[PDB]
Design a protein around this ligand. Structure first.
Ligand SMILES: CN(c1ccccc1)c1ccc2c(c1)CCC[C@H]2CNc1cnccc1C(=O)O
Ligand code: NI
Length: 343
């Protein structure tokens, strides 16, 4: 389809509990409304749903590899390095986040906080408890369980048995003020789902996938060298607004879901102490996004099973298609139904 979200605005969704029970079905719905055209969409769950009953058992959890984020650069163009530090607990990380050195500054509004982020990026290197293999969900949670979404990304584990952490498994993100994730797309241009468990907000910048190539030309212009897959390049919105790169901004609060879409470039930072949970997933539409992307997943099993008419032409390298970033995804295909019956 097309012309659903022609402005490519970041859309916010508030489903009822009945719309919330099927995860894959609701992803097809928000794409039928055009959420995928912004590269990022917010999902506000109903109040009856709570992923964990209490967050007081978490002080003794281990953060195996925290990273000190050292950012260099000037004039809205930066490069961040991630130096690994010693292990610590969440209680220690919380006391370090609210330390005077790392605490959230005084700010009038977000515009003030955004200004102080890009002004004080170089001066202090914050600690980010990122990429922790684990989950904070309860076991009985059956709706939107990040540890088990039951999408077609399970074909990797169900057929080839490969398990990739942060992609097949959930990751945990304990943050503090100024902790940043750089401009990037998900591995193999996969989807991603991020849920903010508790704490201070997490802000997102997102570029629509139909303009992602304009950011890639911009970054190549600054460094003469898919190097943005190093995921350590920071670009200020001042620079994007100067060269005409379309982008939108939204703030994710505690208890809200964020979906990133294939070839949706995103970047952002944490306002203060928070905990986020994230994993990757896929719909039927992603298969063509993963094919054009060639952590390296082999797309062979997806094409051999769900695109079998194109398989031999893809092995011969004669399947040259152009992605239509506006087409919504399908919910089911005859090849997918007969595959679930085989398993
Ligand atoms: C450099 N690096 C690397 C690159 C190549 C291979 C191996 C690792 C790397 C990779 C990942 C990260 C960081 C650094 C530094 C903190 C951030 C996380 C990703 N975090 C998010 C991603 N998307 C959305 C949100 C978030 C978030 O912070 O909530
Ligand atoms: Ni990401």
């Amino acid at each position: 389809h097309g012309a659903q979200n022609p402005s490519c605005k970041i859309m916010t969704f508030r489903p009822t509990m009945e719309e919330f029970k099927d995860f894959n079905k609701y992803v097809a719905y928000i794409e039928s409304q055009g959420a995928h055209r912004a590269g990022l969409a917010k999902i506000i769950p109903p109040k009856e749903w709570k992923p964990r009953q209490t967050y007081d058992d978490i002080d003794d959890v281990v953060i195996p590899a925290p990273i000190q984020q050292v950012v260099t650069g000037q004039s809205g163009l930066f490069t961040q390095y991630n130096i690994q530090k010693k292990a610590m607990t969440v209680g220690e990380y919380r006391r370090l986040a609210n330390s005077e050195k790392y605490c959230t500054p005084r700010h009038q509004d977000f515009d003030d906080l955004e200004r102080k982020y890009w002004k004080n990026l170089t001066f202090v290197s914050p600690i980010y408890g990122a990429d922790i293999s684990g989950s904070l969900y309860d076991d009985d949670v059956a709706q939107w369980n990040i540890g088990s979404l039951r999408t077609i990304l399970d074909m990797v584990e169900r057929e080839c048995g490969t398990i990739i952490e942060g992609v097949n498994t959930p990751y945990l993100y304990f943050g503090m003020w100024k902790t940043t994730f750089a401009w990037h797309t998900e591995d193999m241009d996969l989807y991603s789902i991020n849920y903010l468990h508790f704490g201070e907000p997490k802000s997102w910048y997102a570029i629509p996938p139909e303009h992602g190539k304009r950011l890639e030309r911009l970054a190549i212009g600054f460094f003469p060298g898919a190097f943005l897959r190093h995921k350590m390049t920071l670009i200020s919105p001042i620079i994007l607004k100067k060269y005409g790169i379309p982008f939108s901004r939204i703030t994710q609060e505690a208890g809200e879901f964020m979906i990133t879409f294939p070839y949706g470039y995103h970047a952002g930072f944490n306002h203060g102490f928070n905990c986020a949970e994230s994993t990757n997933f896929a719909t039927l539409r992603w298969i063509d996004y993963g094919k054009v992307a060639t952590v390296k997943i082999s797309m062979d099993v997806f094409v051999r099973i769900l695109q079998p008419e194109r398989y031999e032409l893809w092995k011969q390298g004669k399947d040259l298609t152009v992605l239509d970033h506006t087409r919504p995804t399908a919910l089911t295909s005859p090849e997918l139904s007969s595959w679930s019956a085989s398993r």
